[PDB]
Amino acid sequence: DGAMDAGNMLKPALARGELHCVGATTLDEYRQYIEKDAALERRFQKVFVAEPSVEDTIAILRGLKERYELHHHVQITDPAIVAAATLSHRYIADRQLPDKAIDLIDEAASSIRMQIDSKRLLRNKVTDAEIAEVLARWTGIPVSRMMESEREKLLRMEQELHHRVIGQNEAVDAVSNAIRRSRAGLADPNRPIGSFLFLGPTGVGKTELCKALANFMFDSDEAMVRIDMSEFMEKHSVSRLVGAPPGYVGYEEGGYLTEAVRRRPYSVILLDEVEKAHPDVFNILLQVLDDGRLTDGQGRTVDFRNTVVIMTSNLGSDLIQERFGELDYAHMKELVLGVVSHNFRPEFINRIDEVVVFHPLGEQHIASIAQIQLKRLYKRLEERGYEIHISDEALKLLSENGYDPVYGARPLKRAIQQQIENPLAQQILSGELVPGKVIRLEVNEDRIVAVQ
Amino acid sequence: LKKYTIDLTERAEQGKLDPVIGRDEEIRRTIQVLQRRTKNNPVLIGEPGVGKTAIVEGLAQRIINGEVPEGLKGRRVLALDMGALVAGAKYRGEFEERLKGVLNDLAKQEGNVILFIDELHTMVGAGKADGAMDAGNMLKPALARGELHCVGATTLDEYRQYIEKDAALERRFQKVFVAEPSVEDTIAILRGLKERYELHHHVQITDPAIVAAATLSHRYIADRQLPDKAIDLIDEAASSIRMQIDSKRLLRNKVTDAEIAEVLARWTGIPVSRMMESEREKLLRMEQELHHRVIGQNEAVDAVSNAIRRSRAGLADPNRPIGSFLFLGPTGVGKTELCKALANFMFDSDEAMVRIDMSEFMEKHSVSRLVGAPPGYVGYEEGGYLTEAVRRRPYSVILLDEVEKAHPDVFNILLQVLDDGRLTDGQGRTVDFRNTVVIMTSNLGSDLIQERFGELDYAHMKELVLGVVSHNFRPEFINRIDEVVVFHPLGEQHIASIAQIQLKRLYKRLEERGYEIHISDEALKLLSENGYDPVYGARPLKRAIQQQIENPLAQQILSGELVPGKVIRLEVNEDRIVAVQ
Amino acid sequence: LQRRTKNNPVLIGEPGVGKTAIVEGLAQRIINGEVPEGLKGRRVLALDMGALVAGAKYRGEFEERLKGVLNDLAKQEGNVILFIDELHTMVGAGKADGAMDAGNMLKPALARGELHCVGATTLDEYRQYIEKDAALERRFQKVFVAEPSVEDTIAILRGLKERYELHHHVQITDPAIVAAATLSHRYIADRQL
Ligand SMILES: Nc1ncnc2c1ncn2[C@@H]1O[C@H](COP(=O)(O)OP(=O)(O)OP(O)(O)=S)[C@@H](O)[C@H]1O
Ligand SMILES: Nc1ncnc2c1ncn2[C@@H]1O[C@H](COP(=O)(O)OP(=O)(O)OP(O)(O)=S)[C@@H](O)[C@H]1O
Ligand SMILES: Nc1ncnc2c1ncn2[C@@H]1O[C@H](COP(=O)(O)OP(=O)(O)OP(O)(O)=S)[C@@H](O)[C@H]1O
Ligand SMILES: Nc1ncnc2c1ncn2[C@@H]1O[C@H](COP(=O)(O)OP(=O)(O)OP(O)(O)=S)[C@@H](O)[C@H]1O
């Protein structure tokens, strides 16, 4: 109420030296509590304790190794000591280095002790192979050992992305190679896992590849940090990516890009239609794409160096579908990089690890996207109880009425919405197409409707 | 201790905790942190609804059933209530000795107590009556030494709001991320939890209702989690089934997939319920119900009714809006009348529409009233017009009137709205547009449709360009609108029918005043003679009605020459429409 | 109000629509027996946050009496429907110097179904207060109270004309009832119907 606090009562005894006080505040709690009382800050010689090296932490972890080996009854190997101070320095960003190396050492020791009690893979030894299993569970960044079940999944990464992105071989080979470079440990630890400029015509598979990439590593299309850059046409819209400065509304809410990657650092970032953004929004992504370190408005640096940043754009579109049938991919990428040299600054084009040119879909690709978009329709109809069978006569109606070389594979989905589902919804609604019987989609000579 | 903690492990002995299905790796990771030497305090961060409190309640049932490691056998999970810790704590040091009485009673348990602080961010500043912080700071030595075994459970955005501010306390807690489960992983959640909801409601929840509620709420509810938004479909369908058993041959018992869609359609408004009723007939005559208000435009009334029927059959692409139309055509032909007749069909109110008048977006910076200001700018809290109207009512008609009178890259912000059905505010809220009909009326090619619709069929009036520079100049906005309609110019046989539509609007304006109006078939023909201009559509008829009918009629209503009760008859006496009684 | 978990409904709408006059009309279905067998004899208690925060000067005094309400709502064996007019007031109420508000203390009891709470926020007081507390927004099922038609407002006004004829000792005619719902819907724009 009015009585004396502990600051003002030790203030005589601190200055006189009768009190040999040691404090251990943080740098932030010294500023907002002790440094605001400048008469009390006067009495306290601050000994700055720096965050140590990795090599200083391997010496720290080796000393209290036996204090954690005795509590968990495991033996922590020195490969696990070195790979806890190396891996936590790289992959943990919010924490500080003696501690976050001990958290890996302690929880890998705690998990081995779980694996002897709660059940050669029943043995009391913390190896570097399972410090990383704790860190891949801490962070989500798959730094684990990856023995054969996921090793076989991404040896077939291209034909698992070609289940959903038909054609675009040079693009599926570009993103599958960046995930193999990271998961073989060959990726540059400073830059992101991949930086991709997906150029190409419209409707051609370049946002489909990001949705199939995010489906590959996260089993959900909506498991990417999807950022539509056409909401960033204004120069002051970079406040949506990094957040508001201190003093301003929605400053506590943070950014959208930084706060999504600070939560899950192993992400896929889609920057859709990136040329529609203001040219000062790419300046935010300069520090994201090379030495990935986007900073909040709060001043929290976010490590983007475990993300796959994909920037899909529509820029060589007039030049790609005009010249792809007469150029190889080397001369075509050479010619579209001349077009995006006029849109993006050379600073920004130089950060991108792979500028990928998507080719316009031929008639034999759109005949195969017809199979995808119709199997999506059968799964949409077995939810309602109806069983559809397309004819091969009606498949080459949709692969010909849905083939427009300018507009990609969206006319085919539009042909499915118009001459498959538009008359089929009339007949599901009228009741004359009953479930249970297999619905056959034939052609009379030009178009006939479902028959059962 | 027992004054301030609820025992989750004796709640689990008595069966009062819900069964917890899945989360085998989020409970193993929260056990692995709890078995650490120092700083054994696992924090279950996640979105609100994902199952963070149910991990500790499924850890508490795991240390009872003995599916837990030794060392956690026989633990007590004690839910620390921090509203009870700061309850009577008026005087100084009354909270701080309550908190220390808990910490000293946790030390007498010899580490055989797991502490649960649900809503862990409420510990950050709980005493706080003198200056520097009390709880948090008082638990900070015990949390770092490894003496509490304190399981937290915060959301992701109350962790950064409250706990990441105290970076010394954020240190002491190991973030166990609790991801929102799959639609497949929450079917197994709802199956091992339906007996708790079959028993409270005295109903039967069928497994089709379990698969429906996980699938439908994942698709149709956007501001909800996983297990949380699928449970309250089977919880509120069962609550509604039990109401129509207890209150008013006439009493079903099962919760089926139809009752799940019936409560999701009352939640969201998106009509996902069932198409067996008398409203299945309303959609078969959608073109007849739209042609009571839109004369002609058959290739447009068919095209906007096919997309409603494609959604109600469940055939619509769930990743795009319901329809995405470009209504091209001349002036006064029924482009905005069809978007008004459609919202009058779907919502039975003409103004029940998110109509954006796109002739206010002639500047590029006007696009931020669709989505709102960014963080830090003025009007950021208000959100956008388009985003907050579709966040509230997700099943909408969005009319974008006169799109060609917008800035040519306001349509960039609709590239995600039409292809993907998403649009993000300045506040970072992604609004789903996948249940909207986005109609975009425009007057492009109006000089081309008025010139060539008699010469060409509709297939050629929609294209008819081999090498000419611009049918539509928009590059890749045009292939994500799913159906482009050319509206045709209204002939005299159409404007004879709009003459009767616009006169029935006039008859209702007069029967609200007590007057009863009769048109002759010659004054109807005289309106359709001089209300027919071809290049101006059907507004010169609405001018010919207000000039040749309503202008003498308003002068004769005010002068008392036409009193109510008697029938007013509009016939031609000389070549003019007079009103006689 | 009759589900197992998280049984907290809210008449979210616009100001004037009839949100407070649903819980005033649910509290009359309860007396007249026009509720199901689970709400027979229940009590709709209207918790005001202005009396809980009033005089809660000391540390704990808001917490003590809000926990005192929750301890006294539990003695009712679940027979009390709680009703918070202006539910956005709770989100932040009692906010001292870092301590949690009424929103965080009611968050365990709202999600378990111990509170059969009813909220009555508008659509934009829910958006700026409760929808920011995303874990409290979860505990509350949005019952969207739509603004009625003119044809539903003449039916409203016909039921209330006996209550306004009695306050003013005037006689309201049914043309005056139809005109007040038809003309205000057309000419008044700032209010809801
Ligand atoms: N190569 C492809 N393989 C399979 N489906 C495809 C392919 N290309 C397009 N599609 C389908 O067509 C839709 C539109 O293609 P997108 O790739 O999303 O458009 P886009 O490639 O981003 O081009 P823009 O510039 O955004 S119009 C996708 O959602 C798929 O369903
Ligand atoms: N794995 C699970 N098994 C069974 N029920 C679950 C599971 N996960 C969640 N639930 C239930 O789904 C609902 C989710 O609510 P809670 O998990 O208690 O809330 P929460 O996850 O703590 O999120 P907040 O931020 O505390 S509101 C509850 O009814 C849980 O019982
Ligand atoms: N085909 C029609 N059927 C019925 N009424 C019509 C028709 N066309 C026009 N009208 C009437 O005339 C008015 C003007 O037509 P609108 O459709 O609103 O203008 P528009 O045809 O959409 O073209 P604009 O000027 O470019 S917005 C409508 O409000 C109706 O009252
Ligand atoms: N369905 C209804 N039946 C009868 N009277 C009603 C109905 N809806 C509203 N009213 C009356 O119309 C007025 C509406 O006021 P309230 O319903 O109290 O305000 P509100 O809906 O709670 O909005 P606020 O300002 O956010 S409290 C009151 O006089 C009610 O008595």
Numbering used by the authors:
A (entry chain D): 290 to 408, 525 to 857
B (entry chain C): 161 to 408, 525 to 857
C (entry chain B): 194 to 386
How does the study describe this entry?
Heat-shock protein (Hsp) 100 protein complexes are critical cell stress responders that solubilize and unfold toxic protein aggregates and amyloids, thereby enhancing thermal and chemical tolerances. They are members of the conserved family of AAA+ molecular machines that form dynamic hexameric-ring structures and undergo ATP hydrolysis-driven translocation of polypeptide substrates through a central channel. To better elucidate the Hsp100 disaggregation mechanism we determined cryo-EM structures of the ClpB hyperactive variant, K476C, bound to the model substrate, casein. We focused on this variant because of its robust ATPase and disaggregase activity in order to capture active states of translocation.
Following 3D classification two distinct structures (Pre and Post states) are identified and refined to 3.4, and 3.7 Å, respectively. The angular distribution of the particles show top and side-view preferred orientations, and the 2D projections of the map exhibit well-defined features that match the averages. In the ClpBK476C:casein structure five protomers directly contact the substrate, which is positioned slightly off center to the channel axis and closer to the back protomers (P2–P5), opposite to the seam interface. Additionally, the P6 NBDs, which do not contact substrate, are both identified to be inactive in the Pre and Post states. In side views of the reference-free 2D projection averages the NBD1 and NBD2 rings adopt a non-parallel configuration identified by an increase in the distance between the rings on one side versus the other. This asymmetry is identified in both Pre and Post-state hexamer models, in which the overall length of the NBD1–NBD2 double ring increases at the P6–P1 seam interface compared to the P3 and P4 protomers across the hexamer, going from ~75 to 106 Å in the Pre-state and ~77 to 96 Å in the Post-state.
